[PDB]
Design a protein around this nucleic acid. Structure first.
Ligand SMILES: [Zn+2]
Lengths: 98, 24, 81, 132, 139, 83, 208, 129, 215
RNA sequence: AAGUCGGAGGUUCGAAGACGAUCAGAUACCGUCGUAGUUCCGACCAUAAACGAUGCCGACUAGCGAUCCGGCGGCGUUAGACCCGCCGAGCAGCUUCCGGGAAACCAAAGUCUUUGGGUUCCGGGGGGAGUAUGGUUGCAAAGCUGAAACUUAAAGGAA
RNA sequence: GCAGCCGCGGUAAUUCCAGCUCCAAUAGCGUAUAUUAAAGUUGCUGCAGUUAAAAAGCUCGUAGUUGGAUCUUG
């Protein structure tokens, strides 16, 4: 049975796409089939932002961030629980969670 | 598996051919 | 719309349709007399000219070829019948 | 763990929809009413039914309950809902009309009316919301 | 789809001609095979000499001993294994006696829980096996 | 249906849709038979007269029931022709 | 009504313009396009009030054609039209359903709220989609106050009007009740109706 | 490519009748179409159609009466005789009481009943009922 | 009989004279007593198939019986109802009630000459249910029902004396077989023939005519 | 893609292989290396779940919001960009009782017992078997064409 | 041992060996094989090829097949 209309990838009217490597296991995954996640986090987390700010040499220095674009294969994205299996009707929801 | 069965078949064709060329 | 009148369509919808899909196909193009400000002779040029037309005497350039209707120069008239 | 069973709540609603005029805000008064108008094989069940009747009676006095439907109560609350202002909210001194709406009335017999006030049509078609 | 043309008779006739061979029933009865491999050679019955009495195990889930006889055909020398149909009729079949065997009921197919026996005994010693089973004939 | 001699042999003559001429089946429960009352040409009051329209469930389900009744009212003079 | 006595008067236009019944939103239906006049610069479509009145009278003619007034069922699930259908029922003698429409009142005969009306007037085709789809299993025509984006899956008489604003939905039930009584002969159509249109309007809890 | 024009003409009519349309626009017109629509019109299956001249193949706007169940073509145009005409009446027509099979005979385009009354066979164009 | 619907009250009070009045207005029949009031005299029922369907539960198999009942007066009226209940007697009883509420008018025509009462189907109709399709074809007066035993019981109870039948699909499925045949019979009186081209003269609905009696 | 032959180059990776772990055993998964290969040039090979598991051409049968290209005319903003529509072309999406289907689902997988627009290839229970043999192609690996005896009452799809 | 098929038989077998009884055709009735209908499971009528067996990886291309409208109507 065809489980998904897009076959699990965002490829339409296109023959081949260049692959990438999953961050957990370096395996060849198509760029559209990859479960991407652009994570923007601070270099200093909230548990340590107090000590770093009070020990700074500047009056007002904002801590930088880590702009990392993570890529995941289907298998590792589910073991890492970044995507869950949804109901047969809930799968059709293409909106990101709030 | 259908692919390893296909591999066992080609390994068998290659043996039947060499056994047939010996008596050629 | 089960009883839409196909024999008598409104002129606002026939101009909307493609020039081939109309009830009777008709071009969306036309001709026009271009009067340059330098000379007095008027030249009948095509709307979708696609060539570089010139006035009699090589006074100036009238329009320029484009992907659609030709782009006229400054100070010219058009829309003849 | 003070949730009433459907046996307590259903029997309490039927008692109200049939004997609303006999019940009140006193448990011990309703306890004796339910004992007579209803044959309850237990006394604990009667106190639970009468105790929930007293609870529902405190709700009827403030408004309609989504379970209790009394004819004499619904007709009066609808009759007492007849409220109208001293002047209607539609007959206004001036009426703002878009120039496109003004042209629609122009095609009808109501071309020029003193009650109409044409507003300046705002420039810029920014009605759609940005995508993404 | 199919060709619906006024001059497509040869195209349709040749297509059906070559697609009928994909039908295993048509191909079986239109080639040299399955007729020479058939021990009867196209006949409904055949006579043979009983080589030995053999008991064939009934296939699962059934469990019994099918009383059969290894028969050598007289017409072509082929050795087949018939089946003594009725109850206890194996005792009527002597040794090295001429018997008339026929198909088991299906065209070259094994009938019932018997693994491969596709024949059955009809007569024995020029006497029908049904007459010996009912006692109306002897020997 | 006739019997080639004048006799009528049908159990009943089924209705036909006033918009698509489709026969309204006996189990077409989505079909309707709406009656639109007529008014007096002076007072505009009900004069016990009405126009009858039957629309099968197919024309309703496809959404063309409202436009069909509006057009059927034009041919009967119920709605105006400046519509 | 194509007569002169049934024409829209000037007093009716001032009510429609004040209530905003000509403003029907930015979305448009392909079967409600014939009722739309023109789209403004801010995307809002203008409903043709002339075609709103003709469909309003056509609905009133279908209501007065029902002999028993209790055979007409007025339904409004949304709170904006709950008071408007309760006043319409008292004026016309209809059976109102203003609360939550229980699925089964038309098909399930063993239910307590089981009814068998002959006409089904609806406030919103989307908010009241359940009685519309249930009026398909029984041969019941339906009238609805369809907006510009309202579907016509079963609506037999669509009244194009702004069924979103409280002053607009209350007026469309006041205009229809006024016309049903005028065709029956209760009111003479010569003098203005005694009932004020604000009686049918919805009142917010912060104001009532 | 459009190898048959009568096919697309009757297909548009059959689909417009299924949709409850009042009029259908046949984009390519021909002599066979106009005479085919005439056979359907003489028996009351379609209304009056208006041929539209555009100095090309031409278009036709047919008025649909709703009385037509299905109209279709028979491709290819087989050669039909009088002895073989009853065979097509059992395969194409829905009953022996109504429905017609249009034939193009040397005497012109007509249905199977008129072709039998004129006692002439020919080629089959289509059917309607 | 205590009528619950307005349609049942008019039938109980002798306001509706025949069953063709309900079919004329496509009104739903929700009370089986309405059917027994008109056709209850010459109405015959037949148990086509007792079909045990099983729901996989931990208690081995939960066997529930589904019955197929064909109801018809053998002239112009036939019905088909299914009912799946725990008991066989209850499944048959409930299916008979549903077979009455589904009774449709059967239109019968002639083959060639129109002499006497109608004997066969008016035209070629095809009913479908699942993969099964059943085509009904007219036949001469003395032909009979040339069909399988399953549609023959429906065609004889529908008053169709003669019919040529062709069936494609899994006709071993008696459920889809009987329902496709019943669908083919129900397609009659809805096929627009030239003899039904006349403009319909609209009458008053039973709810409209007897609106005063229903008050 | 892998593979094959001849040159150039071989950073990374890595069949094979070695060794270190894990295990009852691993000749595996995991780790440290590492040959061929991966790269380039020329000549072969012509096979993929080469998939949209859905031939190509043409007509017709709903709606809506987007999007890519071109064209067209309209407030306004900006120095072509944006905004609002229309037309043709295309990749898609969604809502629908258009209809179809065994159903999943499909605006096509519709217009189909109311069966015929044109045309090519191709399927006939499951195995045996893409095997045997013959021919042909290739340096080879293998490609293409392609059976039968015999065996079997199910195999399978969707839910 | 029965059983074309699904199955029956492991100590109360409605299926085998028999008695009784009943049923079917009837001076005929079984069996084996070929063959026709059943088979719309060979397809012109008239099937199929998204997932059940299936549309060549893709395109070009000869033969083959099939090809717009239009010419004497009234
Ligand atoms: Zn991974």
């Amino acid at each position: 049975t065809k489980k998904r209309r897009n076959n699990g990838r965002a490829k339409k009217g296109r023959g081949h796409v260049q692959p990438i490597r999953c961050t957990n296991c370096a395996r060849c995954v198509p760029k559209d089939k990859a479960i991407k996640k652009f994570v923007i986090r601070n270099i200093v987390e909230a548990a340590a932002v107090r000590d770093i700010s009070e020990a700074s040499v500047f009056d007002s220095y904002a801590l930088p961030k880590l702009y990392v674009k993570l890529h995941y294969c289907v298998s590792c994205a589910i073991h890492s629980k970044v995507v869950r299996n949804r109901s047969r009707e809930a799968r059709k929801d293409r909106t990101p969670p709030p | 598996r259908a692919k390893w069965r296909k591999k066992r078949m080609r390994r068998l064709k290659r043996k039947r051919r060499k056994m047939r060329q010996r008596s050629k | 719309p089960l009883a839409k009148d196909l024999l008598h369509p409104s002129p606002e919808e026939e101009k909307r349709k493609h020039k081939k899909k109309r009830l009777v196909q008709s071009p969306n193009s036309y001709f026009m007399d271009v009067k340059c400000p330098g000379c007095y002779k008027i030249t009948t040029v095509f709307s979708h000219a696609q060539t570089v037309v010139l006035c009699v005497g090589c006074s100036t350039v009238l329009c320029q070829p484009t992907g659609g209707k030709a782009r006229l120069t400054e100070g010219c008239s058009f829309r003849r019948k | 763990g003070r949730v009433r069973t459907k046996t307590v709540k259903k029997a309490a609603r039927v008692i109200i929809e049939k004997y609303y005029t006999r019940l009140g805000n006193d448990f011990h008064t309703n306890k004796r009413v339910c004992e007579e108008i209803a044959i309850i094989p237990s006394k604990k069940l009667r106190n639970k039914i009468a105790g929930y009747v007293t609870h529902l009676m405190k709700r009827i006095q403030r408004g309609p309950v989504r379970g209790i439907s009394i004819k004499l109560q619904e007709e009066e609350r609808e009759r007492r809902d007849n409220y109208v202002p001293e002047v209607s909210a539609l007959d206004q001194e001036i009426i703002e009309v878009d120039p496109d709406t003004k042209e629609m009335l122009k095609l009808l017999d109501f071309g020029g009316l003193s009650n109409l006030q044409v507003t300046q049509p705002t420039v810029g078609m920014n009605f759609k919301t940005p995508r993404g | 789809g199919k060709c619906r043309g006024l001059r497509t008779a040869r195209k349709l006739r040749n297509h059906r001609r070559e697609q009928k061979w994909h039908d295993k029933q048509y191909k079986k009865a239109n080639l040299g095979t399955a007729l020479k491999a058939n021990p009867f050679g196209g006949a409904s019955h055949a006579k043979g000499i009983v080589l030995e009495k053999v008991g064939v195990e009934a296939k699962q889930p059934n469990s019994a001993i099918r009383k059969c006889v290894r028969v050598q055909l007289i017409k072509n020398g082929k050795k087949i294994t018939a089946f003594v149909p009725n109850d206890g009729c194996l005792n009527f079949i002597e040794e090295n006696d001429e018997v008339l065997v026929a198909g088991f009921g299906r065209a070259g197919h094994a009938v019932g829980d018997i693994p491969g026996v596709r024949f059955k005994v009809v007569k024995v010693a020029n006497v029908s096996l049904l007459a010996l089973y009912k006692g109306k004939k002897e020997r | 249906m006739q019997n080639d001699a004048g006799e009528f042999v049908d159990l009943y003559v089924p209705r036909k849709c006033s918009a698509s001429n489709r026969i309204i089946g006996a189990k077409d429960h989505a079909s309707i038979q709406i009656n639109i009352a007529e008014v007096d040409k002076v007072t505009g009051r009900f004069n016990s007269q009405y126009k009858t329209y039957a629309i099968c469930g197919a024309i309703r389900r496809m959404g063309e029931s409202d436009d069909s009744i509006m057009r059927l009212a034009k041919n009967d003079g119920i709605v105006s022709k400046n519509f | 009504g194509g007569l002169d006595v049934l024409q829209m008067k000037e007093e009716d236009v001032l009510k429609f313009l004040a209530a905003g019944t000509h403003l029907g939103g930015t979305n448009l239906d392909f079967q409600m396009e014939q009722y739309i006049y023109k789209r403004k610069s801010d995307g809002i479509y203008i409903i043709n009030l002339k075609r709103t009145w003709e469909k309003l009278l056509l609905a009133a003619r279908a209501i007065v054609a029902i002999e028993n007034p209790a055979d007409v069922c007025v339904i409004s699930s949304r709170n904006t039209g709950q008071r408007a259908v309760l006043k319409f029922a008292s004026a016309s003698g209809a059976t109102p359903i203003a609360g939550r429409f229980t699925p089964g009142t038309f098909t399930n005969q063993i239910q307590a709220a089981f009814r068998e009306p002959r006409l089904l007037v609806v406030t919103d085709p989307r908010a009241d989609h359940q009685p519309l789809t249930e009026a398909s299993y029984v041969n019941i025509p339906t009238i609805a106050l369809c907006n510009t984006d309202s579907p016509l899956r079963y609506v037999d008489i669509a009244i194009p009007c702004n069924n979103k604003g409280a002053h607009s939905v209350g007026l469309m039930w006041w205009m229809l009740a006024r016309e049903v009584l005028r065709m029956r002969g209760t009111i003479s159509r010569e003098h203005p109706w005694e009932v004020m249109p604000d009686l049918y309007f919805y009142r917010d809890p912060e104001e009532i | 490519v459009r190898m048959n024009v009568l096919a697309d003409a009757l297909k548009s009519i059959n689909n417009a009748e299924k949709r409850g349309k009042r009029q259908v626009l046949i984009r390519p017109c021909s002599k066979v179409i106009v005479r085919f629509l005439t056979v359907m019109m003489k028996h009351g299956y379609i209304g009056e159609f208006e041929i539209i001249d555009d100095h090309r193949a031409g278009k036709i706007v047919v008025n649909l009466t709703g009385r037509l169940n299905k109209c279709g073509v028979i491709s290819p145009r087989f050669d039909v005789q009088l002895k073989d005409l009853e065979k097509w009446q059992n395969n194409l027509l829905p009953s022996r009481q109504f429905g017609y099979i249009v034939l193009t005979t040397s005497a012109g385009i007509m249905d199977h009943e008129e072709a039998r009354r004129k006692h002439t066979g020919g080629k089959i164009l289509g059917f309607f009922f | 009989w205590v009528p619950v619907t307005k349609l049942g009250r008019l039938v109980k009070d002798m306001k509706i004279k025949s069953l063709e009045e309900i079919y004329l207005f496509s009104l739903p029949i929700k009370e089986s007593e309405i059917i027994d009031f008109f056709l209850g005299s010459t109405l015959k029922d037949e148990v086509l198939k007792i079909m045990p369907v099983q729901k996989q539960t931990r208690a081995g198999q939960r066997t529930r019986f589904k019955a197929f009942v064909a109801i018809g007066d053998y002239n112009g009226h036939v019905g088909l109802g299914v009912k799946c209940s725990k008991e066989v007697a209850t499944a048959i009883r409930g299916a008979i009630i549903l077979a009455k509420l589904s009774i449709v008018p059967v239109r019968r025509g002639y083959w060639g000459n129109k002499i006497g009462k109608p004997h066969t189907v008016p035209c070629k109709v095809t009913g479908r249910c699942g993969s099964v399709l059943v085509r009904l074809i007219p036949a001469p007066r003395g032909t009979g029902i040339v069909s399988a035993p399953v549609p023959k019981k429906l065609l004889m109870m529908a008053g169709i004396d003669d019919c040529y039948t062709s069936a494609r699909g899994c006709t071993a499925t008696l459920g889809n077989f009987a329902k496709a045949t019943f669908d083919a019979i129900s397609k009659t009186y809805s096929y627009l023939t030239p003899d039904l081209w006349k403009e319909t003269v609209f009458a008053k609905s039973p709810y409209q005519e007897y609106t005063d009696h229903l008050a």
